[PDB]
């Protein structure tokens, strides 16, 4: 047969994205956070292009297409970063970009060490669970449809249909080589648990970037155009409970 769905995810997977960080300069909270913010701006461009190219994505109302991306970019970017860390330096450090690799010192200079530890842990989960490149791809796609407003989307039905189909695909990726039920059942359990763990991490980073935006001018931290807008219009909706993640387990 032909792995049509997987052929697609693989084909549309974004390439390498650098942050343009000056590693020849001593680490500073301002320089580091400003470099992460610009990396977010650059990655967002690739996330938009990636999403628009996902199977069925254009079925969503245009307003919803923008909404899911605006709400999920953090989890998506954190997830992809954890995988990069796992496969490049084996989770030893957080591989944000080839030119922005965090060691313990940078994790501390960034003033978000605790959040970094969790991201490093998630990164290790990729190794502990032996996540395959294909499971990573489908799990990441599912993360784009994992957070919605409690009041529902413009066209909620189309979204529900899309999310269901991506869960179905994740389910068949699990039953490719496995020919045992308790086996597939166990794997699905582990992955959904893994997907859920991304949410608390994104929440912390959402709170952290929000507070940073509010007083960025006082700490010399620069927020690019799209980042500043999304963080002050969309992120608050999340922090105030108007928009929530979809958890598999509670």
């Amino acid at each position: 047969c032909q792995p049509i769905f997987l052929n697609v995810l693989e084909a549309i997977e974004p390439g390498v994205v650098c942050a343009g960080h000056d590693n020849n300069q001593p680490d500073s909270f301002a320089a580091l956070l400003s470099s992460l913010n610009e990396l977010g701006e650059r990655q967002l461009v690739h996330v938009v292009k990636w999403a628009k190219a996902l199977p069925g994505f254009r079925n969503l109302h245009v307003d919803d297409q923008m909404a899911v991306i605006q709400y999920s970019w953090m989890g998506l970017m954190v997830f992809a970063m954890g995988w990069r860390s796992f496969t490049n330096v084996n989770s030893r450090m957080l591989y944000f970009a080839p030119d922005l690799v965090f060691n313990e010192y940078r994790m501390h200079k960034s003033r978000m060490y605790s959040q970094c530890v969790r991201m490093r842990h998630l990164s290790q989960e990729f190794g502990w669970l032996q996540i395959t490149p294909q499971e990573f791809l489908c799990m990441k796609a599912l993360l784009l449809f994992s957070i919605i407003p409690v009041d529902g989307l413009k066209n909620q039905k189309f979204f529900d249909e899309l999310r269901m189909n991506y869960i179905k695909e994740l389910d068949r990726i699990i039953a490719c080589k496995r020919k045992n039920p308790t086996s597939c059942s166990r794997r699905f359990y582990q992955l959904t648990k893994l997907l859920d763990s991304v949410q608390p991490i994104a929440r912390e980073l959402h709170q952290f970037t929000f507070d940073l935006l509010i007083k960025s001018h006082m700490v010399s931290v620069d927020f690019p155009e799209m980042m500043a807008e999304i963080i002050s219009v969309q992120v608050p909706k999340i922090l105030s409970g108007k928009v929530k993640p979809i958890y598999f387990h509670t």
Partner: peptide, 8 residues
């Protein structure tokens, strides 16, 4: 905005 221009 620039983000919106991506779908507009």
């Amino acid at each position: 905005s620039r983000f919106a221009d991506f779908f507009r």
